[PDB]
Structure formats: C-alpha cells, structure tokens
Amino acid sequence: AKQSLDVSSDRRKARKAYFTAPSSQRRVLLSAPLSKELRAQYGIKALPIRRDDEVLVVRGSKKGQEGKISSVYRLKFAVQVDKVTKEKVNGASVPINLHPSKLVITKLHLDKDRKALIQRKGGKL
Amino acid sequence: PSRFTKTRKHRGHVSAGKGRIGKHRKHPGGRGMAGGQHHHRINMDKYHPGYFGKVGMRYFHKQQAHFWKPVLNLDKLWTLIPEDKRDQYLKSASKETAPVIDTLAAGYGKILGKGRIPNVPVIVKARFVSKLAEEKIRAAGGVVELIA
Amino acid sequence: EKAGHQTSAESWGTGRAVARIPRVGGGGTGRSGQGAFGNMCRGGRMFAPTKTWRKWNVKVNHNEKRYATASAIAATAVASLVLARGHRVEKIPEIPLVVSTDLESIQKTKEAVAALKAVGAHSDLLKVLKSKKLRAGKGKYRNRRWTQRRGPLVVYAEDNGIVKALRNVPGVETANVASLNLLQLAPGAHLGRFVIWTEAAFTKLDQVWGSETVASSKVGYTLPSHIISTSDVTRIINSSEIQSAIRPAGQATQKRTH
Amino acid sequence: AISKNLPILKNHFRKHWQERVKVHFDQAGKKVSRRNARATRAAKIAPRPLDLLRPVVRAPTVKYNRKVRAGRGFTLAEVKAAGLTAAYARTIGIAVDHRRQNRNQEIFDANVQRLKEYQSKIIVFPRNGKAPEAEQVLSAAATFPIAQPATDVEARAVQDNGESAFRTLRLARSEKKFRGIREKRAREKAEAE
RNA sequence: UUGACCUCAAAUCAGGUAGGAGUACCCGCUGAACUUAAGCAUAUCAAUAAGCGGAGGAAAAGAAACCAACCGGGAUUGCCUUAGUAACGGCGAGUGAAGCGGCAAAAGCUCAAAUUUGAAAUCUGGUACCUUCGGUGCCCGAGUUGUAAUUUGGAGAGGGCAACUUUGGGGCCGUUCCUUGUCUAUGUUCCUUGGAACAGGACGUCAUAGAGGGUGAGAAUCCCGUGUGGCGAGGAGUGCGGUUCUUUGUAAAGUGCCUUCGAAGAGUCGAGUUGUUUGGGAAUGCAGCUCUAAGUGGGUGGUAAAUUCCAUCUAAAGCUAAAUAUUGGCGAGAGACCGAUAGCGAACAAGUACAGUGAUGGAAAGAUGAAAAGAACUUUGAAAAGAGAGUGAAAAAGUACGUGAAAUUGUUGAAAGGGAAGGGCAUUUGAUCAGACAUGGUGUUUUGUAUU
RNA sequence: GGACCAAGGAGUCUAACGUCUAUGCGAGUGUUUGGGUGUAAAACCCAUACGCGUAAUGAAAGUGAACGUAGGUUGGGGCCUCGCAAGAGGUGCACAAUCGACCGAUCCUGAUGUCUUCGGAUGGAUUUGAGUAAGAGCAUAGCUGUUGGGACCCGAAAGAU
RNA sequence: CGAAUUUGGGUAUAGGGGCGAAAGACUAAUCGAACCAUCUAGUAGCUGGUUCCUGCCGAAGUUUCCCUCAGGAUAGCAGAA
RNA sequence: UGGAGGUCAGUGACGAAGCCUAGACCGUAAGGUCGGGUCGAACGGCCUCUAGUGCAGAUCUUGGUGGUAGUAGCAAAUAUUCAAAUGAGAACUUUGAAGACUGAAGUGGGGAAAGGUUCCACGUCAACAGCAGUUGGACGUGGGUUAGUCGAUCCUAAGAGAUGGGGAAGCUCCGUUUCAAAGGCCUGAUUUUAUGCAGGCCACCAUCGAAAGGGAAUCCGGUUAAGAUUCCGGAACCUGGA
RNA sequence: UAUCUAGCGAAACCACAGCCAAGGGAACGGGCUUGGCAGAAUCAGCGGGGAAAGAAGACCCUGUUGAGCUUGACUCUAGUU
RNA sequence: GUGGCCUAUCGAUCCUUUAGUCCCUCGGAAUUUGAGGCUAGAGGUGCCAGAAAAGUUACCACAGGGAUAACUGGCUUGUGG
C-alpha cells in the first residue's frame, strides 16, 4: 500500500489525471516493454514508444504481427503500426490503433537522446 | 437508529399516529412557555408550584468561591486516612499517636456529625466544624483544630 | 445549505388552477413557472437537509472498551470461536498460537510467508487471497472498489521488521500488544480472530492486563469477574449435589390422554 | 407548549444559532498540527527546553487556597535572591514577572530554591565557545515539577484544653458582627463627659 | 532701497502616494421587520439581515487606572468549566455574562514629560563614487515653536566608594525552507472460454512494491505508478555549527553601598442629564450637551449618600509573535455523501441559450461500438428512403445509436360484446401447467454383452 | 382531490431533558479540553481539574442529621426449629400503613457566663422542608415523550431592508 | 374637428413617493401603495397530503381552568413496561 | 430499499444487474425462489451497523402520454380565369392574355424611431410560410453601403453636471458663479540665451444637452445584380492655407 | 358559414361512466333496492340533464389573519412653539 | 362568643403602601441615612383563575367554514289557504 501523503489513491483523481494528461506525460504513459532479446541486450524493461520503433503485437486479434510504428497518437492514447490496418468495404486501408502495453519492442530507433536515456535507465547498448 | 423508530411502522397509515380529527398542527397551544398564567396555568399549579413571582433578596456579583464549603460527615471522616495505615490506626487506638486528618487537603470545608466514629482518638484539622461533630470527636478522644 | 434555495420563487396563490407551491418567475426560459422550494419539487431542497452537527463519534466507557477487548482476546483462544469466525485453523496444531521472537525480528515478505506456511496460517492467507471480489454497489467509486477477508493478526512486543515484512502479504494484520484494537480482535463484532502471538507478546499480556497475582498496569483496572463460576451449567445440573435433592421427573413428553 | 410533569427547560435557540455552529472535526488534525509545531520549535531552538521556567505560586481564592500551582514568572525579589538580573534571567530562560510581589516567606523561599535548582541543572553555552551539545530535554516544567508542601506529619499528640473549637468559631463570628456597635458604644461612653 | 521671516499660493517643477477589485474570516458605523409573547405596544427576533467605511494572512486584543478579598493571583487570545448560573425581564415569553480552577500558546516592551549646551551630535533630497533592499563624500535644505543619545514607573537620573563581568559588520562552507528533475523489482509461460483474457486451470516470480489508474472483461507480476533508497538543478539563505577582511583603541553594556531627587498624558478624569446599549440591577459601556478637577492625587472595590479607614492599580499617548477565526483565493488528501428529475443552477460551447426597458430571472442537455470497422456494391424510387448485400461478438448497437419500462398505439392470434366495465363465492367449458412410479427397496426375462 | 403513466415526494437532525430498558463501574462515576503514541481523523495509553452524586434547610445571616439493636406497632416474601400427612413458633430484607426520634426553618422558654448586651444551654409548640434514619449514583446506548430550532410536507393577506 | 386642439423628439417629477380639469385615476397588460432581490423555508388554534405486512390490546367527544367557544392545559377513557 | 463492518476462500462474459412473460413453487401477507425471452459487467445469502429507506391521491413536482378527435376549425379586408414554360409533382412559381382592385390623407414614391443584412445573385426545399410550393423576408454559399458640399461633428434650449465651497458616519447631497488668488489673446521680443520678457489688450464661469431647432459650401446626365446629391463625365460652390 | 370532400389540425374537460320511475339515503341517484326495460355502428341538429365547464364564494360568519381610510381610541412622532 | 339564625354579598403574579420583628443583606471593614429581604393586611383586575385598547370599508385582501346566515330541496303547519 501507499505511504506518502502526496500520492493519491483516489480513482476519480487518477482517472482525471490520465484523461487530461498533456502530451509530454502521455509520452511516458504510452511506454512499451522490450522483447526478451532486446531486454537481454540493453538491460531495459520498458521504454516510451517512438515513431520509428519496430514492435510485435503480443495481445489481441493481431497477436504475432510485426511492424514499424507509423505514428504515436498520444491524443488517442495509441500507436499506429505500419502493416496493422483494416481494409474497408470501399477498399481503403485505415490504420488500426493499439496500445503500447500490448506490444513488445523488437528494435529501437536510437538517437543520441534515446541512447542517453538507455544509459540513464541503466542500459549497456 | 432510524429503522427502530415508529416512523418506519407508520408507513402506510394516513395520519402517521397523530390523529384524523385533531391533526399534527404547527403550534396549537403556543410556543415554549406561552400562556403559563392563562391556559397552561393548570399544568403550572399542578406540577410546578412556585414558578411565578420572586421571593428572596438579590446578590449582585455573587461568587460561588465565597460559599465553597463541602461538608464531611463523621461516618465518612475515617476514609480520609489511607487504607494501608487505616487498620493500624484503628487497632493502635491511643492518644499521642493519633492520626492527623487534613480535611481541607481532602477538599472539605465543614465537619458534620452524622454519627459513630470509633473510639480511636484523632486530630482533625477543619476550617469549620459543627457542635455535635465536636462533641463526638471529643468523646472519641481526639481534637479538632481549626485551620484556615 | 443553499441547495434548492438559490431561486426567488414565490407562490402564485389560489385562483390560477395550480397548486400553491412556490413557482419560479420570469419567462422565456422553460424553468419559469416551475415549482421550487420543496422536497416534492424537482430541483428543490431535500427534506431536513443533512447537517454536519449530526453526532458522528460516539463515546464509550473506557472500562467497557477494555471489557470488550478482554473478551475478544479470550475468544481468540477458543478453538471453536475462531472456526466459526472462519479462519482456516483446522491444520494448526493448537491455538492460541505462539511463535518465537525471531518472528518479531523477521525482515522480508518472502520469509514472513514462509513463517506463515510453517505455523499453519497460510490457509488463512489463501482464503484472503481468493476472497478478493468487486464490491456490490456504488461503493466502488467511493474508493472502496474491492473486498476481501481478514487474515491472521500477528501480535508482537517489539518491532524489528515484522510489521514491514507482513505489510505486503494480503490480509495479514500486525499489531502491538500495547494497542490490541477491538476493531481487529473482533471485526464485524464477531468474536474469535485468528491471532499469532510472539513469545514476548504472550508474556507481556499478563503484565498489560493483570492477573490474580500482578496488577493490570492500567491504573485502576482489573480484569472483569464473571456472573457465573463456570459455563458448565449442565455439569452443575447433573452433579450429584443437585440431583440428590431433585425429585424424580416425568417422561419428557407427556402422553396424550383423552 | 406546556405539558405533563417535566422540568422547565431553558434552551437558548431562538436566534440564528445554525450559522454559529462550531463542530470540532479538526480535533485530531489540530492535535497533529500542535505536535508538529512543538517538534518544529524544538528543532528550531534545538538545545533549549521548549518552555520557560515558571515559579510556584498560590491559587488566589478561598476555594482553591489549598492548592499551589505554576505562576507566570518569578518576582524581581526572587530573581535577585537567586542572584541574577531580570534581563539575564529572561535571557537564559527564566520567566520574570514584575507585577507579582511576595508577602510570603514560604513562597519566596520555594521560588528561590526553584531558581537555584534550575541554575544548577542548566548549562549555558558561551557566546563564542566550543558549543558543548547537551542532549536537550523538552520540558522545564517536567524537569522541575510543582510539588505541594507537607503541612503536617501523619501522626501527632492530642492537645485538648476545652475550647470546643465551635464556641471559638461562634465567638469569632459574633466579635466580627458586633465590633462596630461596640466601638460606637465605647465612643459614646467616652464622649459623654 | 536691499534682504529676510510668517502665512498663503502656482507650476506638464523632482520624486512619490491614494482611489478600484475581492471581501469566507477580521475592525467599526448604521440598522430593521417578519417572528415569539398563543392578542399586543416594553421585551423577543437582535445589539441579527440589508446599507456604509477599512485591513491582513490572519485581523483584533495585548503587557493592568486588571482580577481579587485570598497563605492572594499577574499582558492578550482560545478551549473545558463556571453556567443556563449571579443578574436582567409586561420578573411574562424570554434573556444572561464574569472572577477563580485545568489546559493550548506564551514575549516583551516605548514615547511625552530632562540642558548636548564644551559645540543639532539628528534627518530628506540634489550631485558624485561604490561592494547598490544599500554605503561613503560634498552641497543646498528640514529643524532650536526641538531633530539624535539618555529614562518609561518593573523604574530611572545626577553626585560619591570599590574598581568586576562582558563584543561588532559582511562574503564563503554546510544547516534548513521552498520549487522541482531523474534513476531505482517480479509471467505477458502453457491450456480452456471469448471479438478481446484483464476470466477459469497449471506452474512460477517479486514483495519495505498485493495503494490507485490505464490497457479490447475482476491484471501485484503488460504499462504508468506504488514501496525503499540514490543522484541532481534553481530560489531563499542572519532558526545556526565552522573560515574569511580579523577589531572604529579610551571602539561599546550590566552589577553592589550612601546621598539628593525622581518630570509621568486636561474640555481630560469626574459630575449631571439625555439617547442607546448591557446580565450590570438609584443607571455596564458608548455618544451628545452642560459643568469641569487634582497631586501621595486619580480610578476601581457590581446598592444611592455623609463621615472613618483598608485593599489594588496608575487612565486621558504608542508597538508587539504564538495558541484563535476562515462557505473567498491557491495547492493538496479524503468520505458508511449524491449518482444525471440526485449532487452546485451548471458532469455537456452554464451563469450558456433566452425572458425582461431595467434591477434581475435563468434552463434543458451524459452513455454506438474494443476499434467507424459510420454500411463498398446491386436494385427500385425525383428524392427521402426501402429491399438486398456488407462491417461488427452483437445492427435485438445504424448517429432518430448501451439497456429500453409504463402510460399510449399498430398488426396478428384468442375470447367476450341486448343502456357501462371491472370484483367475491362456487362450479362448468376451452387453454395451459406442476406434482410417485429405472430410482435406498421386492430378486433373476444379465438390455446399448466393480455390475442388474 | 383524482384523465393516465414513470421517476421524485412528507415526523428528520441537533442542544437540553422525563420515564423505561441494556451495559460498565459503583460511594463513586465520566480517558478522548488537553497530553503521550501511532500501521495516523482509527486504535491504544495518561493526569490535574471539572460535571454530576455522596446534606439538608432558610429570603438571608446561618445552622446542619443515632434518647434506642438506626426505634415501636401492623402486615410481609424467604429462611430456621418443630407432630409420620394437619398445623405452631422464631427471624423477619424489600415494600406499604401508623406512632415516634434526629437536622433545617417558624413561634416560644430563655442556664451557667458576660465586651451588660452579647451568649444560647435546657426545654417546648393543632407549624413547616423537594430532609436523616447501614448511601445509589455516574457514564454510554436504544425506543417513546418534551421544549427551542425551517421542525412531518406544501400553503397566506402582510411587514422590513 | 382651429382650439383648455392633436402629435413626434428632448427634458423634469420615483413608490407612503410622483402625478391627477379628481375616477383612488395613472405611474411598462401590475395600483386603496409599482416592480426586483433579500430578511424568508416569515407565522397560521386553518385547509390539504402524510409511503410495507401481519399479530395483540383498544378509545373519546365528558370534568375544571383559559380573550376560552374550529384551540390548549388538566382529570377521565387507552396502550406499554 | 440505498450504503457500512464480518462471512459464505458465495453467483457471474460457459452471461451479473436490469427488464418482459393470463409459466411453476413457497409464505396469511409484506414478499422470496425458480422456468423462458432480452441483455452485456457486475451482484447476492447470512450475522450485525446505518439511513436522504417503501406512495394512489397532496387543484403534489418534473417529464411523457391519452380520450375528446381526424373533431372545433383554417369564413373580415369585392376575384379570379385561360394557355405555355419549368418541374417527379403546379389552384398557389415564371411568362403571355383576360378580368379586377388600390384610386394620388393610395395597396404608389421616400424617409424618422426601431430592426440588422431582412438588400442582391447563385444553388436549394429537411424544417418554417396553420393548404401547397419548383416559390420566399426560409436554408446553404457569396456580393453589396464609396461624400470637403447629405447628416453627425459645432451652437445653445428645457435641463444635466464637475470645479471652489458647504453638508453627510458614509455610499454621496447641494451648488454652477456661488464668501475662489479661477485664463487665453494681439503684435514686437525674436538665435551673445529664446519661444524667455521692463511690449500690449482684456476678464469669459467647465462641460454635456437637438441626425425635426440654429448652421459654410453641388448640380445635371450616365452608370450597378445590388451604392450613389457619395462612383464616372461635365459644370460649380465653400472653408482653411500659403 | 354551418354541411360534404382534399390538405391541415388544436382546446376546455375527464374518479369510473353514461336509459328511466319510485324508494330509501348527507332529506333532488348514472351506479344501491324494487320495478320499467334492454340489440351493432352511426350522421346533422338541439340545448332538458350531467345539481355541465370556467375561479380554494367576491355575500355571510369564524380567525386572538391583514390592509386602505377616519377620529376626542391607545402609544408615539417629523415639524413648530 | 373566632362577626351578622343558616344558605350570596367577592379578587392572583408584578408593583406600591402600611403593621411587626428591631430580625437578615448592601458581598474590603465601621457608623448613620437610604435601599433591599422576612411575616400579615390594604390599593384590582365585575370579561369576576385577573390583557393596557376607537371606528369605518359600497375600494378591499387572506386562511377557512355548509361547525353558520342570505335560494331550492327536506321535517313541522303556528300562520296563510
């Protein structure tokens, strides 16, 4: 159970904070776990998901489907992954959004800042 | 609690226990002590005689500390002695070894003689004493010393 | 206090073919002409609005509190009362359950669970773990979302990691012998909490509550005396002392005559 | 309004009493705040005892005449007899009360003894010394408790001569009551040639 | 004639300052009536609402012209109590404090009245310089109709005898307060249901972390967090333990003994009267008017007065934290509260739409689905749209969308229907339906070839 | 009064109390103003006071409860003794009648002693008290009843700012 | 129907007040005292309503006093303990 | 019946709650339990605690719905008809013809107050025009208002209203030249310094108040879908400057 | 106009309803009792009944409910002297 | 013999005023005034268990009342016929 007086176990306050989180905090909220291989290589459990990250779906109807992120829709609290879409009646392909908690990250888009973030979290590249 | 009240049982009966003829009206006899000399005079003269009028003389700025004087009776006098030594004092009943009781220390102002202390002598320090209490203590073989 | 009264509604009186309740004035609103200021009225004030000077805390005599605490402590040592209270103590060798002060000195949750398994409180633990269910009403969105049973109460004398070690394991409570809440000793006013004492706690019980040879350490307190010398009134009734003076009885079921 | 046999109750609720209702929901919160304030002051004045040294004084009236309690501050005479200036005592933590006098040798002596005990029990750090920390206690009042005097021993000898101790009271009351008329009578008997 | 001084002006002179908001709490003024008295006028409501002026984070009060009558206490405030009491009151209805006692918090003080008189030692501003919440020069100004030091009644001032004990201002290092930032464990393994597993089952792991939230359903272990620690950044830094320039060199305060003194607030105390108020009662406070002081004098000592004493303080000048208040503001945490006719009027583009000339009045209105996947295409219609088809777990979710009640209605089916209908008892008729029969038991014809 | 239907809709809470009841302790009783401590509005602990009770009476000054086995008489449940079943005696709590005694008030009598007008012993009286006469109370809770409050809910004509 | 005429705009008078060739007329469909908000959930011995079941018991409209006569107190009748 | 403490290691996406069902059982009853349909995420038994706890009425409240009832009614202002066009559709739109009316204190042409885009064009008919609609002051999208001369602006009227001053606890009231030391206006000074001054004249009572009062000055012709005494062409006038 | 048709389309009111005679009854029934009687569904009229609708009688009385006005009512008061 | 031969012939609280005790209090203590208490009368409430009280409303208002008048109906039929 919680100890400190600054953390609130109010369901209402927690839900309000989540649903009115700005995009900067939604970036952390949309963190995703790395694969077993990536976790072994880096030493990182989960990272905030990015735009050019390579992931695999491990939950839902598209379980076991790989792809590169097409966008990180923080407003919609989801990520859109290339090759995870739906074909409509008219033949148009609309992206299928899904939550980063249900992906596994199989290849990170590394920048200077992403590499520094890995070192900060304690990684080894 | 609310579930034990007769309001829970009056649910379904029209008048809620207040009558159909004489209803539960707002203040059908006055508010408070109204009409205590006119139409509640019967209740006053039955249950509270002496309610109306004034008798004594006044006392502007009366302080009860002036009249603080708790009364201790002789039959309760010996409880002011600690019970560890009370038996020893009673058994070794003699002068020149009498227990000393500070009734003011106990918190009393006057000693009254309600009866039958034992024949054990005792020195009792009292702010005020009564005549009978004094005679009873003298007969028991002790003394009352006035204090302040 | 201003709910239902933030209107300037006035009664229309009789002669207008409507009830005499106060009505909102004005026009062009959809609210104008509507009833106000009544418990029967939509948007009006409730009957007898709830006040904060209602009595919330209720006083209890210190001696009655200590009587209830002593009764709960004594019920913790009745094997049948703990089972009726539902505490999965069938596998326990005997109760009251006393464990060494090394339990007071324990440090980790894993070894706290190991100690519970060793002494037989684990069954109570799985009861609490498998009793977790959603609340059955509007109490979910009042920060009371889940309900679960009450596990063992580990009562200690000194805190050396026992509290933190038992803190995370679900349903186990930890208490000091000095406090020993009735709220934990008889939850729901049901006697017979399953209590695991430490050795130091068990020995401190006599000093903190008194005995026939030591004083209570609560000044002016002594353990209550019973109205009766024993609860075995059946033994008293069937003793020879009473049966000898008792006259012969009938057949325990009167035969129907006529 | 008035009905069966009941006491006459005087419930003063004819004003807007509901606006002036204070219910102390913050009793526990205010206790926590007070304890926090005491801890904060202790850390702020760390070695100091969180309260001044008060004197022993007598309760005023005749009802409470028996008790002896804690006063506001020591008399200037008391602090002089202890051997220090009022300003210095105020400085090193002794409550000094100017307006209280001492017409009582026993109370004066008891407060002198309290001052001497305090001076023996405290250590005053130098202004530019080595700061010898001294494991602060948090209560001058707890370290120097008020103790009631021992007015008499447990047992004595009966000294009885026969004044009855009630004739004494009656005569004292009578003397006080009739003093003035007696003075007037003597004045007339002396002014009559 | 030339220079002041006094008083009064003017300036788009130099620099400031006030207004107005919000007012929950706070300080005052003004001020009802409804109401109660079973009528009503005194009274009550109420020294309240409305009205007006003025502050702060608290305000106010506050170091006795006190309480008390005791063996006396000792600034103020608040709580418990005193106490529904003393007292007031058509002594009716009603109203109604304070001392003591226990506690929380505690903190003290400073002007006026003194000759620096061997030195206006005081201060604003301009102009310079600088280490700029300021300092140091110089220069006019203010001020002698009194600015500094010195003293505030607890005292204290001079005059003598000894000749003791005692520091200042600013940076730096860390306290510490505040605003934060980041890092810090453990399954998404197998099987069933399902659209989705977050459900059930098996095996596990972490736990000082099994609070809470999110994720396609009840998720400690999927994510954010949580728990325990670590590591940073910035502001304030004189609640404080150490270095720095290290001392203006007669650069600066307290104490004992004797003497002489010892200034202390005026249209103010006080008295009378009038009005109001108070529990204050031959008058509690306040205010108007009239009179109007004194010097061991003056106030008080809760019954008016004269004479005689005691007790207690020292007014008519001022400052001051904390304990106390707080339906406003800004941050937080919570609840045996409410759950969209409830809870704020407002869960929504709510003080919105719109009503009134105006003051003001003032709503209704939440829910597709996990995801629009929001229905391609065909066909009939002018089209709306229908019929197919299609998506979806579901279209018995199609935007007029969760569930979809009742009143009320359509269709179908069944019944009755000579100026109501409905109901009770009882049967009849039609419709509809539950309740032993292989089953614990009787003994053999062992069917679907431990068992019948 | 009611065309119909749905939802909402009316003896509540509080301060102070009466009776009764349950409980704890009991001549005492009540921790919770506050302090200590806490797994933090819980729980647990701790005083000094204060409230109520243990003394009444009188306007007040004041005085203040055993002539007795804490009295006598009548009645008393229960217990004790007794004739094998009837039936006597003894003791008799509570309680109810009655006669007393004690404390206060009122009206008298006023003894030694005198601050010579104080004192108030002793004795009394168709008087009187919410008294004594081997204490019962204090806290908490519950129904019911009372009063002030919006006061079971809705309802004026009015009055004031 | 050439005037004590009719009328626009501006302006003045504001609620115990205005204004009135006077009807208590008019003062924003409001007038023998406008409208708005508040005191205010004003008071009502008066009218209306007052929400589940079963079981047991079960009345009074009479006495006395009351500015009392549509209402109370009191005694009675009733329940409960 | 809502919520709370315990417990059934209770029921449940393999279907909780809710709802519908002249289906069954149980209880005298309040009610409880179950079969079937619908639905899709929570809920119940027991021991206790708690209350904003049970409706048929209150000319109750809010919302919804009826019978009446396809009923009253859609009848003032003389009145319409024929044919083409458009259109799915024409009594109602457009055009042509006829018949009429207003009849110049108009049913005409313009303005004031008020409105606010209703003006005009294009597209369009779900709602609105109490029938209809292809039409519209409706809906959607856009376009449009051009000034030295017309107004405002300036003046003052009844009046309103600062200042000086005086009341009032005060919000504010009076007062408008009053018991005021109340300013701007002519020409030289006029670049050893300016707009200083020994130049000179005087002495108003702020200000606001009229789109009908008083006032400086513009006319014609043409022009747009919609503006024109405002644009263009021509022809003038006034004011203030040099 | 009413009327019939196309389109369009309300409201009052409504416990349930809608045939009478007598009886009794809150003393003038649609319902109850006893008789008369009694056949779908309806259209236009009509004004006998529904003690028809419209409004918590505006007359009268009661209330210890007002208000406007008056006066040598009681108690005050601005002004004035 | 404790007023009238008997049955009638009268009056609270608060306030005032008398009589008596020479009694109690004025709360820091005399004393003397004054004031306040104790007990009993008197000053009065006739609406007589005891408010301090003029009208009008044909301009009117509210809560109610068929507890109550002004029609019908109903019982009675003095009176009328």
PDB file of C-alpha atoms (C1' of nucleotides) in Angstrom, chain E residues 114-194:
ATOM      1  C1'   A E 114      15.058  66.299  31.491  1.00  0.00           C
ATOM      2  C1'   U E 115      20.101  71.317  29.343  1.00  0.00           C
ATOM      3  C1'   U E 116      24.264  68.147  24.030  1.00  0.00           C
ATOM      4  C1'   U E 117      24.622  73.181  25.740  1.00  0.00           C
ATOM      5  C1'   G E 118      32.455  72.471  25.629  1.00  0.00           C
ATOM      6  C1'   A E 119      29.961  72.732  20.271  1.00  0.00           C
ATOM      7  C1'   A E 120      21.806  69.548  16.030  1.00  0.00           C
ATOM      8  C1'   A E 121      25.878  65.265  17.940  1.00  0.00           C
ATOM      9  C1'   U E 122      19.629  64.189  14.048  1.00  0.00           C
ATOM     10  C1'   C E 123      17.383  63.714   9.082  1.00  0.00           C
ATOM     11  C1'   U E 124      15.236  64.317   3.357  1.00  0.00           C
ATOM     12  C1'   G E 125      16.846  65.489  -1.395  1.00  0.00           C
ATOM     13  C1'   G E 126      20.469  67.053  -5.489  1.00  0.00           C
ATOM     14  C1'   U E 127      25.099  65.958  -7.312  1.00  0.00           C
ATOM     15  C1'   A E 128      29.400  62.356  -7.487  1.00  0.00           C
ATOM     16  C1'   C E 129      31.773  57.444  -6.346  1.00  0.00           C
ATOM     17  C1'   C E 130      30.987  52.302  -4.908  1.00  0.00           C
ATOM     18  C1'   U E 131      30.776  46.059  -2.765  1.00  0.00           C
ATOM     19  C1'   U E 132      23.549  49.443  -4.866  1.00  0.00           C
ATOM     20  C1'   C E 133      16.855  46.388  -0.368  1.00  0.00           C
ATOM     21  C1'   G E 134      22.239  49.986   0.442  1.00  0.00           C
ATOM     22  C1'   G E 135      27.261  52.739   1.844  1.00  0.00           C
ATOM     23  C1'   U E 136      30.573  56.783   1.649  1.00  0.00           C
ATOM     24  C1'   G E 137      31.766  62.149   0.329  1.00  0.00           C
ATOM     25  C1'   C E 138      30.205  67.268  -0.808  1.00  0.00           C
ATOM     26  C1'   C E 139      26.265  70.612  -1.299  1.00  0.00           C
ATOM     27  C1'   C E 140      21.831  73.398  -0.636  1.00  0.00           C
ATOM     28  C1'   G E 141      17.500  72.106   2.529  1.00  0.00           C
ATOM     29  C1'   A E 142      14.443  70.349   7.408  1.00  0.00           C
ATOM     30  C1'   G E 143      14.918  71.548  12.278  1.00  0.00           C
ATOM     31  C1'   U E 144      16.316  75.215  18.068  1.00  0.00           C
ATOM     32  C1'   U E 145       7.981  76.770  18.018  1.00  0.00           C
ATOM     33  C1'   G E 146      13.352  70.768  19.163  1.00  0.00           C
ATOM     34  C1'   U E 147      15.808  66.546  15.253  1.00  0.00           C
ATOM     35  C1'   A E 148      19.959  62.433  17.969  1.00  0.00           C
ATOM     36  C1'   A E 149      21.992  59.892  22.524  1.00  0.00           C
ATOM     37  C1'   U E 150      19.980  59.370  27.555  1.00  0.00           C
ATOM     38  C1'   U E 151      14.952  57.335  31.098  1.00  0.00           C
ATOM     39  C1'   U E 152       9.296  54.910  30.854  1.00  0.00           C
ATOM     40  C1'   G E 153       7.384  53.887  36.819  1.00  0.00           C
ATOM     41  C1'   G E 154       9.178  46.824  36.751  1.00  0.00           C
ATOM     42  C1'   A E 155      11.799  52.156  37.160  1.00  0.00           C
ATOM     43  C1'   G E 156      15.351  55.707  36.469  1.00  0.00           C
ATOM     44  C1'   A E 157      18.548  60.474  36.651  1.00  0.00           C
ATOM     45  C1'   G E 158      22.576  63.018  38.512  1.00  0.00           C
ATOM     46  C1'   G E 159      26.756  63.107  42.992  1.00  0.00           C
ATOM     47  C1'   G E 160      30.435  59.905  45.680  1.00  0.00           C
ATOM     48  C1'   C E 161      33.001  54.389  47.426  1.00  0.00           C
ATOM     49  C1'   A E 162      35.329  49.908  45.370  1.00  0.00           C
ATOM     50  C1'   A E 163      37.244  49.146  40.521  1.00  0.00           C
ATOM     51  C1'   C E 164      34.210  43.137  38.460  1.00  0.00           C
ATOM     52  C1'   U E 165      31.838  40.587  34.298  1.00  0.00           C
ATOM     53  C1'   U E 166      31.134  41.293  29.223  1.00  0.00           C
ATOM     54  C1'   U E 167      31.548  42.269  21.589  1.00  0.00           C
ATOM     55  C1'   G E 168      30.835  44.195  16.468  1.00  0.00           C
ATOM     56  C1'   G E 169      29.608  44.189  10.381  1.00  0.00           C
ATOM     57  C1'   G E 170      29.937  41.475   5.658  1.00  0.00           C
ATOM     58  C1'   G E 171      31.088  37.261   1.930  1.00  0.00           C
ATOM     59  C1'   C E 172      32.392  31.555   1.876  1.00  0.00           C
ATOM     60  C1'   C E 173      31.318  26.097   3.712  1.00  0.00           C
ATOM     61  C1'   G E 174      27.363  23.231   5.095  1.00  0.00           C
ATOM     62  C1'   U E 175      22.148  23.539   8.318  1.00  0.00           C
ATOM     63  C1'   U E 176      17.473  24.237   6.847  1.00  0.00           C
ATOM     64  C1'   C E 177      12.816  26.071   3.985  1.00  0.00           C
ATOM     65  C1'   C E 178      10.706  26.034  -0.934  1.00  0.00           C
ATOM     66  C1'   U E 179      10.008  24.761  -6.372  1.00  0.00           C
ATOM     67  C1'   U E 180      11.169  20.770  -8.719  1.00  0.00           C
ATOM     68  C1'   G E 181      14.029  16.646 -12.176  1.00  0.00           C
ATOM     69  C1'   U E 182      15.772  11.635 -12.958  1.00  0.00           C
ATOM     70  C1'   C E 183      17.049   6.620 -11.736  1.00  0.00           C
ATOM     71  C1'   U E 184      15.696   2.656  -8.626  1.00  0.00           C
ATOM     72  C1'   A E 185      11.648  -5.496  -8.631  1.00  0.00           C
ATOM     73  C1'   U E 186       8.725  -9.537 -10.394  1.00  0.00           C
ATOM     74  C1'   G E 187       4.976 -14.041 -16.385  1.00  0.00           C
ATOM     75  C1'   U E 188       2.515 -11.373 -20.520  1.00  0.00           C
ATOM     76  C1'   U E 189       4.910 -19.342 -19.867  1.00  0.00           C
ATOM     77  C1'   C E 190       1.164 -23.465 -21.170  1.00  0.00           C
ATOM     78  C1'   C E 191      -4.193 -24.984 -21.513  1.00  0.00           C
ATOM     79  C1'   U E 192      -9.953 -23.793 -21.987  1.00  0.00           C
ATOM     80  C1'   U E 193     -13.995 -19.794 -22.951  1.00  0.00           C
ATOM     81  C1'   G E 194     -14.222 -15.334 -25.572  1.00  0.00           C
TER      82        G E 194
END
